[PDB]
């Protein structure tokens, strides 16, 4: 098309060797997150729900059994779907809760393209995508 | 670097990465790479107020076929155009979790795009 154009080209590698999983940590623009202010940070799985009980429901005429019977269950602990807790700059700093995004797959998936020392790009699949928001927004 | 700590070098170093939506058949083809693991080339061509980004498979992967063997001419490797998208209304960062449980902020997403089938 154009008589002249400036072009940049990069070799792309897709490693199979990866002892690392790549994830997305997303912040809402409204929370105005600025990394320059981050001096230190901790990121740990929040296991608070592990010991939280929930009420689960378990001859008479059905219309005579309006009052149902309930028990309590200690759900299956999947540390994978437990949210993340991000704590920035000690006890007096900001805190965010990370929740996994779930509008799950179709015929595509996301990849992270990162540049390497030799100039090539290496592409890695996104393992999980988390939306992080101030702990104060969670109840 | 203690247990539970998030390494921050990447984010504050302002290291940038691209986040790309890839068709399943193309990523499946990338899995057929061997040797160095190269799959092709990313091309960025700029003209007056206009940018065209695309990905083209290398000769090796362009010649590995599924039950079919491709039709007409068998021409040259096909260009997969990228549809560029915005990232301004959100801050996306990448963090990794290694096999040893180490967590680190690797960089910030500076460009988003969707790779379209050729």
UniProtKB/Swiss-Prot annotation, chain A:
GO terms for molecular function: DNA binding; phosphatase activator activity; promoter-specific chromatin binding; protein domain specific binding; protein phosphatase binding; RNA binding; RNA polymerase II general transcription initiation factor activity; RNA polymerase II general transcription initiation factor binding. It comes from the Eukaryota. Induction: Up-regulated in response to enterovirus 71 (EV71) infection. Its main location: nucleus. It is found in: Nucleus. One of its GO terms (cellular component) is transcription factor TFIID complex. Keywords: Acetylation, DNA-binding, Nucleus, Phosphoprotein, Transcription, Transcription regulation. Belongs to the TFIIF alpha subunit family. Heterodimer of an alpha and a beta subunit. Interacts with GTF2F2, CTDP1, TAF6/TAFII80 and URI1. Interacts with GTF2B (via C-terminus and preferentially via acetylated form); this interaction prevents binding of GTF2B to GTF2F2. TFIIF is a general transcription initiation factor that binds to RNA polymerase II and helps to recruit it to the initiation complex in collaboration with TFIIB. It promotes transcription elongation. This is General transcription factor IIF subunit 1. It comes from Homo sapiens (Human). The gene is GTF2F1. The chain holds residues 5 to 153 of 517 of the full protein.
Curated annotation (Swiss-Prot), chain B:
One of its GO terms (biological process) is transcription initiation at RNA polymerase II promoter. Its main location: nucleus. The modification N-acetylalanine is found at residue 1. Heterodimer of an alpha and a beta subunit. Interacts with HTATSF1 and GPBP1. Interacts with URI1. Interacts with GTF2B (via N-terminus); this interaction is inhibited in presence of GTF2F1. It comes from Homo sapiens. Keywords: Acetylation, DNA-binding, Nucleus, Phosphoprotein, Transcription, Transcription regulation. It is found in: Nucleus. TFIIF is a general transcription initiation factor that binds to RNA polymerase II and helps to recruit it to the initiation complex in collaboration with TFIIB. GO terms for cellular component: microtubule cytoskeleton; nucleoplasm; nucleus; transcription factor TFIIF complex. This is General transcription factor IIF subunit 2. Belongs to the TFIIF beta subunit family. GO terms for molecular function: DNA binding; RNA polymerase II general transcription initiation factor activity. The keyword Phosphoprotein applies. The modification N6-acetyllysine is found at residues 21, 32. The keyword Ligase does not apply. The chain holds residues 2 to 119 of 249 of the full protein.
């Amino acid at each position: 098309g154009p008589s002249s154009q400036n072009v940049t080209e990069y070799v792309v590698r897709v490693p199979k060797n990866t002892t690392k999983k790549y994830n997305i940590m997303a912040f809402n623009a409204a929370d105005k997150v600025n990394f320059a202010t981050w001096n230190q940070a901790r990121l740990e799985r929040d296991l608070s729900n592990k010991k939280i009980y929930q009420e689960e429901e378990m001859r008479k005429l059905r219309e005579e059994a309006r009052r149902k019977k309930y028990g309590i269950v200690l759900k299956e602990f999947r540390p994978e779907d437990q949210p993340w807790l991000l704590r920035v700059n000690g006890k007096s700093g900001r805190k965010f809760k990370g929740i996994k995004k779930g509008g799950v797959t179709e015929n595509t998936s996301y990849y992270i393209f990162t540049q390497c020392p030799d100039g090539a790009f290496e592409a890695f699949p996104v393992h999980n995508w988390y939306n992080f928001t101030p702990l104060a927004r969670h109840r | 670097a203690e247990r539970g700590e998030l390494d921050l070098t990447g984010a504050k170093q302002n290291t940038g990465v691209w986040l790309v939506k890839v068709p399943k058949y193309l990523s499946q083809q990338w899995a057929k790479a061997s040797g160095r693991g190269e799959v092709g080339k990313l091309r960025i061509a700029k003209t007056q107020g206009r940018t065209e980004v695309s990905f083209t498979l290398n000769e090796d992967l362009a010649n590995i076929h599924d039950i079919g063997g491709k039709p007409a001419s068998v021409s040259a490797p096909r260009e997969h155009p990228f549809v560029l998208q915005s990232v301004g209304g959100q801050t996306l960062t990448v963090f990794t979790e290694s096999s040893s449980d180490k967590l680190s902020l690797e960089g910030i997403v500076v460009q988003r795009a969707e790779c379209r089938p050729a």
